[model samples]
Target: QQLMMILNSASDQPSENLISYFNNCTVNPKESILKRVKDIGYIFKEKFAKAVGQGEIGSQRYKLGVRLYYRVMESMLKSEEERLSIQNFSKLLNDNIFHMSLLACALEVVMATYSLSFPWILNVLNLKAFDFYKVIKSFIKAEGNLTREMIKHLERCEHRIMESLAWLSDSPLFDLIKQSHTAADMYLEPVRAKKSTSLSLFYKKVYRLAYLRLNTLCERLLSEHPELEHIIWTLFQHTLQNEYELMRDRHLDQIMMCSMYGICKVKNIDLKFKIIVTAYKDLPHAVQETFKRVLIKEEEYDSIIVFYNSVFMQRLKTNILQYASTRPPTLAPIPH
Candidate 1:
């Protein structure tokens, strides 16, 4: 052994070359990792889609969507750190979808009036008997193609819609209906003037209550997370602008409907349009007729997008914030 004296000093030598070799050996090719990640995501999407299709997601659908979004965002941040500003990118993504859904919901209510059970009062006012089903079908088709341009147009005309509803509520015509009908005869009226007036008042009251609730909730939400105020303000401004436009237009029916819809989506309230409509019906025919006239105008369609955009933006922003908060801490400070 002494004669051989060739000690195994391999371990004592620099391990850099060995370590490098091991790292290289264990490393996956960039393309391979990316493909694997993509495949995993696709599988998740497929499963989620299946769940949604079956309606098994139920009330959890929104939550699930938000969770998935954040997961995807996290992976995006990891891979594209140099290319993206996490917070801004997240806000953009959220705000876009939020605005879209809010608008869609508003449109849905407008479209709902075309149903046989809920004939379009506007058409009835024109003495034009419309096929309820046909109206609904047409609305469904048009809604499928809703675009940002359409939304902008609606926003421009929202003031008219709001003003119209306010006028209908306070119109002397409505007051006559409320006073003329006997309690029993009220049920027989085409639109129950008295009941409608009451319902309209109730709707307004509810709207005020909803606003109060939102203000309280927003305060709490902001207190816990002040960073979200920017997106919130974006939604708030959009809604305010749309509301202002509606007030200007004086389209009372549209205004009332849009306002209720907005409160429902923002506060997660569940309300039926029939309740509002029936209330309007209880009012005098003249008041009802006034509302019907406003509803029929092509201009009303223009205002539809405004309500839709406001609601959509609100929900989208909420979803994004929820997603961001649940995600891992991958967001870095905005670059100077």
Candidate 2:
């Protein structure tokens, strides 16, 4: 009777379930159904806010919300839902307190034991279900909470994020990378720089992946040959800034290797290229899987060398010597 009353109020012909009406409401262009739903949804939001106060959801409600939202997403995946329409529904989710609360609760569950908090998770949820799934997958991996089914879901998120990143060549990701340096002394300190957290979780992870790889590579090289620090940082920054064009059609791993080669070439450092590649090869599989890159065989190192040689000479003609030194200079004793 309550369901009938709600549907009757919303002008949807007494449907068996809300899903059908929701689908119809979204499908229709006129949006008369949506206006009614919006009106009714606002009332629910008010009641829910009063019921829950300023705090989070209760356990029973939290469990119900997670299950409900997760199943809805799974079924939506099965139904060949369009991203655009899903986004519309995602916006609608914001209108209802229960829907948003459900997602907040889900975020809390998935991200439990991780440092990311509700405000950040709330920022993440604004993009769409796709992003929500992406964030959830990342947290699951971080927490080692993966099941067989969860792996499949996680891979799907990975695929979608990579595909989207691949499709767009001129993404602001490059800008983020250009501006990505630790405020702390990376060479002397070697501490975690508190990686960027403001961007979409997808890009945030991308930045993290890049930071980890570059940091590791630079650390190894600098430890062996401290003089190489400025040149390596210079080359690393240059490669990242010009990445979309300079290393177009290469994996991030490949690009990173080539960057090392670039520094070695310009500075005439004695480090063997094979050893550099080996260092990358030996990084943990989780780090390697971020890009789904194929491991570089012994023979493939030259190909990257050839690629970098061509790109370096033609596109990037940076005279490494002429550029101002990156390291701060000391004042002469004679000035005193």
Candidate 3:
């Protein structure tokens, strides 16, 4: 009995030691992770700037990339009117097709960064869903220069992406890169001049459809509690941060998936995770799962709760809830 007691006591001592060690290792503030992440991001930006100066990446590309970043940031910071104007300006530039491709690439990079840091920032700011609608409206307005020709090309691209999304919804490797490549090819087509279709007419059809679809989607979503809009904005901010972190982590494919998944969920659109994974078969499953989980658990939940509580606390006295209830059920059905 004495030997048994000694053995138990010895085991308890190690367990207590292990618990102490873990407690010591655990961060107290928890926000220290975000501070460390932001610090690293500052270093990364410096290195990236140096790379641009060294001509490792072209100055024009870098400039456009920076412009895209500024546009997104401006959308976040500016008033609705100012943001709308900037978005309109971006749209006009994007109408050039080639410029659109470059912008998309820039956006891909920006979004990669957004995914990492957005959640932390949203937590700090206590933002909500109307804020998201405001930002998107601004983005669309900035990109409002979608000419008929550009619209046609966008339609084709959107269709292909939708198809790809359908196929790779369950997969972690959605054909995001391929879609970007195709978009780039289309952007360069006018220079190639291989197509027989009238660019103007094609663009007109494309523009109409694109505008109609986007407008409908936006209107429907906005009709929900204004809080939905803030949730989306928070998600966007979170995505921006995530993207930056993933880039530093050197997880390119995961970064893309993280952004895509977050956008789809925030927009309440259905996308197959497995199909997405299959689409990007070259990447590892672990990376794909990590990105997918980040979208499902991190961005989606964190932003939504913030959105719901903020709206309830701030705007409940107003007609926001009534307005949301009266809204047409056209936007993606509220998840059960």
Candidate 4:
């Protein structure tokens, strides 16, 4: 864990030793994890519903996560209810403390609410919903699929996060990473170095380093197109920091495809979906091995061979992304 800690550039400790974060969570998952995930959308809905005016981002009336805990969950209280039971009220208070924790939950909730898969992060750290306290990141230490799942949560599609948010307090950050866990750090450090945790510290460093690399790439992308200063700037301005998506495709394939996507949207490229699919043939062997589908969806295209010849993002690399691909691509499916 010491290896994971960032030097001086470090650290998520609050007054409490953070062990308290562990004692609180135990979300039972008998129902569909999908159902549970879908329910999250309902929570996001209420935040918009009761918010100051048509879901303004900076409404003062509610503490975003707090309203989600109180109003949103309470609505599920058997028959369009208006409030939570006092016991349940405190149940949520444990999650919604303030400031840093508040921002942490907010970022994850946004990703989980609208975008792609993150069952582990959503299920474990936030504990099946969006609760942000210390030890959430520490939860990654626990066993199977957790690390991969955290990576997925971090890598979940940036399209929503990139397009929606307008301002970020952490200017350089492109996604959510945490200093939130220290319980493991509490236990693992040697006696003299007793209080400190290499495990917690390591995880924190890895996440920040993950974003550090991402923001740099983002900077390069911005710098390359001086003319795109305003456009790219606007794009980055709204971009939220999170895990970098798997860059598994060939360098040429990614740039060519993504660049065409930009041209199609901006200059209005009149390419056929077929051209895009056959163009897939142009990708390198490495890309083709992992390569799955054309980014555009069948429903959006003109019954082109690409849909059949191609695999969906869900069908190919990450099946969990099946939920994400259900909707058509963000821009017009058939490029102009």
Better lDDT candidate (1, 3): 1
Provide the clashing-pair count of each candidate structure.
40, 0, 64, 14
lDDT against true structure, model 3: 0.32
Off by over 4 Å in 1: 1-243, 283-286, 294-336
Compute the lDDT of residue 247 as modeled in candidate 3: 26
> Candidate 3's residue-wise lDDT over 46-103, tens digit each?
5455534553333333333435533432332233223234434333223333222333
Question: What is the C-alpha local distance difference test score of candidate 2?
Answer: 0.43
Scored by lDDT, the top model is 2
Expressed as tens digits, the lDDT of each residue in 7-58 for candidate 4 is 1122222212222322332432213222433355455445444433464352
TM-score of each: 0.20, 0.42, 0.21, 0.22
- In the range 213-289, model 2's lDDT, one tens digit per residue, is 66677787657655554555455455544444543334556655655666666556677666776676666543544
Best by TM-score: 2
Ranking 2 against 4 by lDDT, winner = 2
Note each model's CA RMSD in angstroms: 27.6, 16.4, 25.5, 20.3
Q: Provide the lDDT at 329 for model 4.
A: 24
Give lDDT tens digits, candidate 1, residues 1-336: 210122121122213432332234323223332343344334434544553465433223232322322232233323323433544333323332222222222322333322111112222222111111112222223333334544443332222222343233343333433343111111122332234533343234334433443343344333444443333333333343333333333443444344444444454445444454445455322155433443223345333444446533454454333423545223222211
Lowest summed lDDT window (length 10), candidate 4: 159-168
